[PDB]
Amino acid sequence: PQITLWKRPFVTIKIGGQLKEALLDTGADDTIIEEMSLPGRWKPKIVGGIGGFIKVREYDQIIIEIAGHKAIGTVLVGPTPVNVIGRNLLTQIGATLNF
C-alpha cells in the first residue's frame, strides 16, 4: 500500500498467535513489542531514545505478519509505550520512504 503520514501509521500485525496494532517506524532500528510470550531463547538488551533507556528481552528468528506481509527477524519485548515495527522488519516487507 501507499501510506500517508497525516496520522500515526499504525497497522495490524500478527505475532506469537496474537493480533496487535503497531507503528511503522523508520526511526527505529529494531522492532519492540509490549510484554508478551515468545518461543525460544532470549537475551537481555538495553535500548534507548527520547526520554532515556529501557530494558528488554531480545528474541531472535521470530515471524511477524505485518499488514499481510510475512517476515522474520529479531523482536524485542519490553515496556514500550507503543508497539513499534522498526527497520529490521520494514526492509523485509519492502517498505521505502518516498517523496
Ligand X SMILES: COc1cccc2cc(C(=O)N[C@H](C(=O)N[C@@H](Cc3ccccc3)[C@H](O)C(=O)N3CSC(C)(C)[C@H]3C(=O)NCc3c(C)cccc3C)[C@H]3CCOC3)oc12
Q: Residues with catalytic annotation?
A: 25
Q: Strand 18-24 vs strand 84-85: parallel, antiparallel, or unpaired?
A: parallel
Q: Does 12 bind its own copies (CB under 8 A)?
A: no
Q: Which of residues 2-61 bind ligand X (CB under 6 A)?
A: 23, 25, 27-30, 32, 47-50
Q: Does 44 bind its own copies (CB under 8 A)?
A: no
Which spans of this chain sit near its own copies (rule: CB under 8 A)? 1-6, 8-9, 23-29, 32, 47-54, 67, 69, 80-81, 84, 87, 90-91, 93-99
